[PDB]
Amino acid sequence: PQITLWKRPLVTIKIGGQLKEALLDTGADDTVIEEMSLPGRWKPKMIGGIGGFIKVRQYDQIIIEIAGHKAIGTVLVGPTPVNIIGRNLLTQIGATLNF
Amino acid sequence: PQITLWKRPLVTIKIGGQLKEALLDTGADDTVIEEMSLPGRWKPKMIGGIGGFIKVRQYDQIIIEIAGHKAIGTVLVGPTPVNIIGRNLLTQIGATLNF
Ligand SMILES: CC(C)CN(C[C@@H](O)[C@H](Cc1cc(F)cc(F)c1)NC(=O)O[C@@H]1C[C@H]2C[C@@H]3[C@@H](OC[C@@H]31)O2)S(=O)(=O)c1ccc2nc(NC3CC3)sc2c1
Ligand SMILES: [Cl-]
Numbered sequence: 100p101q102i103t104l105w106k107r108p109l110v111t112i113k114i115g116g117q118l119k120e121a122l123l124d125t126g127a128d129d130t131v132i133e134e135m136s137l138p139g140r141w142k143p144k145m146i147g148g149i150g151g152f153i154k155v156r157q158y159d160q161i162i163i164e165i166a167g168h169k170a171i172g173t174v175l176v177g178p179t180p181v182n183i184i185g186r187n188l189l190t191q192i193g194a195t196l197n198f
Numbered sequence: 199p200q201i202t203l204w205k206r207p208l209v210t211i212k213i214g215g216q217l218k219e220a221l222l223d224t225g226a227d228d229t230v231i232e233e234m235s236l237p238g239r240w241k242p243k244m245i246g247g248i249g250g251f252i253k254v255r256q257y258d259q260i261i262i263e264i265a266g267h268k269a270i271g272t273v274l275v276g277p278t279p280v281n282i283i284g285r286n287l288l289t290q291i292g293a294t295l296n297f
């Protein structure tokens with residue numbers, strides 16, 4: 100699709116068999132999702148945004164569908180205010196910015 | 199142009215007579231620039247991101263050149279760690295996300 104930006108670019112994602120809403124975010128290096136259970140081990144990461152830093156759990160090689168496109172990669176889980184799809188997964192679905 | 203997302207989508211902007219580097223950020227509703235002076239009236243605002251909120255100054259009707267394309271809109275000025283071009287100005291340069 101071609102998505103204009105007059106509204107937030109929200110899409111449906113599927114992770115762990117569950118549908119969630121998430122923001123396509125070119126300003127995010129990484130994908131960050133609200134608290135949920137994911138399989139396997141995690142590693143620590145601290146990420147910085149506009150109001151300071153949050154600690155998150157880094158899960159690697161997680162299967163996630165984004166707007167009907169399959170991706171497999173790193174998902175950070177933590178107290179993010181919104182679910183964000185960052186460039187690590189936007190590149191896997193072939194997204195570009197165009198003007 | 200077509201901007202891929204392998205790296206941060208940074209562009210040059212001109213604002214307030216100054217050249218700056220800023221991130222094209224589909225996850226940002228508003229445009230937020232590091233502390234600088236702008237002419238005219240402003241009012242305070244609180245904006246929230248990862249980590250929490252920061253206080254900014256809201257200036258309306260500010261002209262900004264983004265990668266060579268002129269646009270006018272509201273600009274928020276405050277202690278953001280990155281200059282971000284949000285949707286309020288991305289729309290005006292005709293930017294879309296495509297996949
Ligand atoms: C600020 C930019 C440089 C980074 N953010 C992405 C950004 O698009 C953010 C996404 C986002 C977070 C949030 F907590 C709430 C949101 F609604 C959206 N937007 C934002 O703060 O807009 C704010 C939203 C609200 C208030 C103002 C106005 O527009 C901009 C600002 O609307 S971030 O959410 O902090 C973010 C995401 C992943 C991420 N990955 C990282 N990886 C590590 C290696 C560096 S750092 C990092 C930071
Ligand atoms: Cl990844």
Ligand SMILES: [Cl-]
Binds near residue numbers: 270271286
């Ligand atoms: Cl505006």
Ligand SMILES: [Cl-]
Binds near residue numbers: 103
């Ligand atoms: Cl349009």
Ligand code: NA
Binds near residue numbers: 239259260
């Ligand atoms: Na003004």
